[PDB]
Design an enzyme around this catalytic site. Structure first.
Site, PDB file in Angstrom:
ATOM      1  N   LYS A  38      17.305 -31.774  16.086  1.00  0.00           N
ATOM      2  CA  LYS A  38      18.392 -30.760  16.140  1.00  0.00           C
ATOM      3  C   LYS A  38      18.148 -29.925  17.192  1.00  0.00           C
ATOM      4  O   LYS A  38      17.105 -29.968  17.847  1.00  0.00           O
ATOM      5  CB  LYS A  38      18.351 -30.094  14.690  1.00  0.00           C
ATOM      6  CG  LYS A  38      19.881 -29.464  14.494  1.00  0.00           C
ATOM      7  CD  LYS A  38      20.430 -30.309  13.242  1.00  0.00           C
ATOM      8  CE  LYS A  38      21.782 -29.669  12.958  1.00  0.00           C
ATOM      9  NZ  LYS A  38      22.677 -30.438  11.989  1.00  0.00           N
ATOM     10  N   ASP A  57      28.012 -30.053  15.949  1.00  0.00           N
ATOM     11  CA  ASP A  57      27.654 -29.193  14.793  1.00  0.00           C
ATOM     12  C   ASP A  57      28.537 -27.701  14.712  1.00  0.00           C
ATOM     13  O   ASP A  57      29.585 -27.708  15.412  1.00  0.00           O
ATOM     14  CB  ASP A  57      26.111 -28.845  14.640  1.00  0.00           C
ATOM     15  CG  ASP A  57      25.693 -28.752  13.270  1.00  0.00           C
ATOM     16  OD1 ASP A  57      26.353 -28.674  12.351  1.00  0.00           O
ATOM     17  OD2 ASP A  57      24.394 -28.780  13.101  1.00  0.00           O
TER      18      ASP A  57
END
Ligand SMILES: NC(=O)c1ccc[n+]([C@@H]2O[C@H](COP(=O)([O-])OP(=O)(O)OC[C@H]3O[C@@H](n4cnc5c(N)ncnc54)[C@H](OP(=O)(O)O)[C@@H]3O)[C@@H](O)[C@H]2O)c1
Ligand SMILES: N[C@@H](CCC(=O)O)C(=O)O
Ligand SMILES: N[C@@H](CCC(=O)O)C(=O)O
Length: 416
Positions: free
Chosen positions: A102, A142
């Site tokens: 991430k 995201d």
């Protein structure tokens, strides 16, 4: 409440249900690579501001790491590490040749103009280029990042990469014009609907004609309600947003409610519907309840009051472990969060496959492949649930960690 700490505790709790060596657990408790970079951009007023960017690659035993990029003013390194750890188990439970990873930038994008946003995306790529790639690390959209930023990032990567390989496959969630994949807008809701259908099949329920209540009416909640009504034939009786809830025994039409919310900014005061709030919305007599909003909404305070036969956790961690217990002894089948909202990551793998191969598919093919993936993942988790007599969530942790542990042993990283 350190985000990372909580993730490690959940992993240990999980390891208490499976045969995993202590060296493998110690390996899985630490991200394999963390990169923190300075991201300098030129502001519209001419000055130069430097932002903090992250890229955590938790584990890549199963293949290239996969995970989105968050642009949040409250972003921290620990949050990114915890989310990368969760991404590992998310790609492992749905069986993807991916690892976990991430990224994020500590920025308030609502106060950045479009040009400054493009500069930020390009600078982030220029900063983290050396650790990302089509076969190394594939970012994705995201929180507060969207396909437009994904296209900017892909273009910058291709510029640095001199077009020596599949630069389209370096990042997913792109616009359809530049290597984007179809069916990606309703990926998460479609996966949740598939899991709900399989859960009902497991419980011996034919969902045609029963009630579903959805909390949160963003893209996830709205599309969850819509696809429930069409594909599963269920009746949508209650929806809610960041303001309040609307309930109708006869059933609400998701399109009309979305129009209402767009027009006035909230779903409240919908015609021919009783206005309610989230707390009393969580306990309607429905067959399926789908929390699709902010975290920590079901707690021991109201866990006993929940009356849904199936709870589909679209959001990330809506249910506390204690509520998991009471829901279990109450007789309610919970779909774990990172199994239910597996559609997102799943679609991203499909997109990558298309980019790597140079050949794209259609809507039907994507839909069918997603159906098979999500059905298989749910059934493996449920079979572990039955065999080990543990919580569904714990079964998802068993499946994912077992896959990652096997991959780690096969490479010879851990000798036991
Ligand atoms: O990705 P994604 O599309 O699924 O994420 P997303 O688009 O941000 O979904 C957020 C949804 O959850 C709602 N929400 C945020 N905080 C809430 C709260 N404290 N209580 C109740 N609802 C809340 C949002 O309401 P709003 O859109 O009204 O802010 C929106 O409906
Ligand atoms: N934050 C997204 C990223 C998934 C992806 O790589 O598309 C999720 O895991 O739900
Ligand atoms: N973050 C989303 C669910 C996960 C996703 O959409 O990637 C929510 O809380 O609504």
């Amino acid at each position: 409440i350190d985000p990372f700490e909580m993730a490690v505790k959940q992993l240990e709790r999980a390891a208490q249900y499976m045969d995993i060596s202590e060296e493998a657990l110690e390996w899985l408790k630490k991200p394999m690579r963390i990169v923190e970079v300075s991201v300098p951009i030129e502001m519209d007023d001419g000055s130069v501001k430097v932002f903090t960017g992250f890229r955590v690659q938790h584990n890549w035993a199963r293949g290239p790491t996969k995970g989105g990029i968050r642009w949040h003013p409250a972003e921290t390194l620990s949050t990114v590490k915890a989310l990368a750890t969760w991404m590992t188990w998310k790609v492992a439970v749905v069986d993807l040749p991916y690892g976990g990873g991430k990224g994020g930038i500590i920025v308030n994008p609502k106060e950045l103009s479009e040009r400054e946003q493009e500069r930020l995306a390009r600078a982030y790529i220029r900063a983290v280029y050396d650790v990302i790639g089509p076969w190394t690390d594939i970012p994705a959209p995201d929180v507060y990042t969207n396909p437009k930023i994904m296209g900017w990032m892909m273009d910058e990567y291709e510029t640095i990469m001199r077009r020596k390989g599949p630069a389209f496959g370096v990042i997913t969630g792109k616009p359809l014009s530049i290597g984007g994949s179809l069916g990606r807008g309703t990926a998460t809701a479609q996966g949740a609907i598939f899991t709900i259908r399989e859960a009902a099949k497991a419980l011996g329920i034919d969902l045609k004609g029963k009630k579903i209540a959805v909390q949160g009416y963003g893209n996830a909640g709205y599309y969850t309600a819509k696809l429930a009504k069409e594909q599963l034939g269920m009746t949508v009786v209650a929806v809610s947003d960041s303001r309040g809830g609307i309930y109708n025994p006869d059933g609400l039409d998701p399109d009309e409610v979305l129009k209402w919310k767009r027009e006035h900014g909230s779903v409240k005061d919908f015609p021919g519907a009783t206005n309610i709030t989230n707390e009393e919305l969580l306990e309607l007599e429905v067959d399926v309840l789908a929390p699709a909003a902010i975290e920590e909404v079901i707690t021991e305070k109201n866990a006993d009051n929940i009356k849904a036969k199936i709870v589909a956790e679209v959001a990330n961690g809506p249910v506390t472990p204690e509520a998991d217990d009471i829901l279990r002894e109450k007789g309610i089948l919970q779909i774990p969060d990172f199994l239910c909202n597996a559609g997102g990551v799943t679609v991203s793998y499909f997109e990558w496959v298309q980019n790597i191969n140079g050949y794209y598919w259609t809507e039907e093919e994507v839909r069918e492949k997603l159906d098979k993936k999500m059905t298989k993942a749910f059934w493996e988790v449920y079979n572990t649930h039955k065999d080990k007599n543990i919580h569904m969530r714990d079964a998802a942790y068993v499946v994912a960690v077992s896959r990652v542990y096997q991959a780690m042993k096969d490479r010879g990283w851990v000798k036991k």
